[PDB]
Amino acid sequence: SHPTYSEMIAAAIRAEKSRGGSSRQSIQKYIKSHYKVGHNADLQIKLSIRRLLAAGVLKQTKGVGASGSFRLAK
């Protein structure tokens, strides 16, 4: 087991230190090195971020070249 993808993505963002937020890359490398996830985790981490951004719980920032960064809305 592991918690829900959303709960693993909030643990992954709470551990980041930055004047931006976490990248989808940062969040897949944290979750894969700390929980017992399977081979479809890539897919599952993108799907929950798409959902968590729509529900209002993640916020995002985009720049030029800046591929996408995620912070917890409060």
Side-chain angles (χ1 to χ4, degrees):
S1 310
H2 47 58
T4 53
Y5 264 95
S6 6
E7 254 182 282
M8 290 185 291
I9 294 174
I13 287 174
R14 279 174 234 144
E16 201 65 40
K17 302 294 291 303
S18 193
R19 41 184 129 179
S22 291
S23 77
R24 212 171 129 266
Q25 309 105 263
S26 306
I27 297 168
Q28 323 220 137
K29 299 226 221 62
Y30 178 96
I31 292 179
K32 289 184 185 61
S33 50
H34 284 312
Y35 310 82
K36 244 67 182 75
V37 290
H39 282 95
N40 290 321
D42 51 344
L43 287 195
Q44 286 170 122
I45 291 159
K46 319 198 213 288
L47 197 51
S48 320
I49 283 168
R50 296 274 278 280
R51 286 177 180 174
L52 250 29
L53 205 46
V57 0
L58 239 46
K59 290 271 139 271
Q60 154 177 249
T61 317
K62 271 180 169 165
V64 186
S67 328
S69 203
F70 297 123
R71 24 119 170 193
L72 279 168
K74 275 5 182 291

